């Protein structure tokens with residue numbers, strides 16, 4: 420695989436979750452952004468792949484699984500088989516990466532998106548591969564029990580602009596946030 424993409428929503432303390440869910444009530448526009456970003460492939464007849472941890476998979480309402488129009492891969496050191504609705508189960512990021520290169524897959528897959536949690540983000544960030552990180556910074560603090568790993572500001576350069584990513588601070592339900600994109604070049 421030539422490059423990875425990661426997408427995350429973070430609040431002020433770099434928190435990404437609480438009690439198995441998100442720290443904030445629903446933001447419509449943030450959500451649509453996530454969907455649009457992870458679903459949109461730039462090649463006819465291909466689909467994007469989403470990789471996520473076990474807890475993240477289970478955080479999705481059951482009736483809503485797997486994320487439509489994407490190949491869902493779940494990572495677990497404990498499961499024997501893919502949880503019901505998931506396309507593939509992998510024992511590590513490496514395995515997942517490998518699988519994707521598999522012939523069966525390689526042809527069917529456009530983009531690879533890492534959708535968390537912590538450990539998954541971390542692993543992906545450490546691979547010495549081209550990587551783009553799409554961060555939504557919510558400019559408020561909510562109680563969180565799960566956090567985003569530390570990003571190496573020497574590797575990941577924040578782009579000042581990116582195609583299709585609004586630049587201004589957004590607002591919704593009295594909350595402000597901004598979209599940011601960082602890029603690591605290998």
Ligand SMILES: NC(=O)c1ccc[n+]([C@@H]2O[C@H](COP(=O)([O-])OP(=O)(O)OC[C@H]3O[C@@H](n4cnc5c(N)ncnc54)[C@H](OP(=O)(O)O)[C@@H]3O)[C@@H](O)[C@H]2O)c1
Pocket residue numbers: 426427428429434435436437438439440441471472473474475476478494495496497498509510511512534535536537538539542565
């Ligand atoms: N704000 C956001 O953008 C965002 C995005 C995602 C999730 N969230 C939130 O974060 C929480 C879930 O995140 P989390 O960090 O707690 O959990 P997680 O990464 O989704 O789940 C962890 C489990 O996943 C498996 N796993 C994780 N990384 C792995 C690796 N490299 N190789 C193999 N297995 C791996 C392990 O399963 P086994 O124990 O079976 O081995 C591990 O216990 C929820 O609150 C969710 O709502 C927020």
Ligand SMILES: [Ca+2]
Pocket residue numbers: 497
């Ligand atoms: Ca476990």
Ligand SMILES: [Hg+2]
Pocket residue numbers: 429430431432433434442559560561562563
């Ligand atoms: Hg927070």
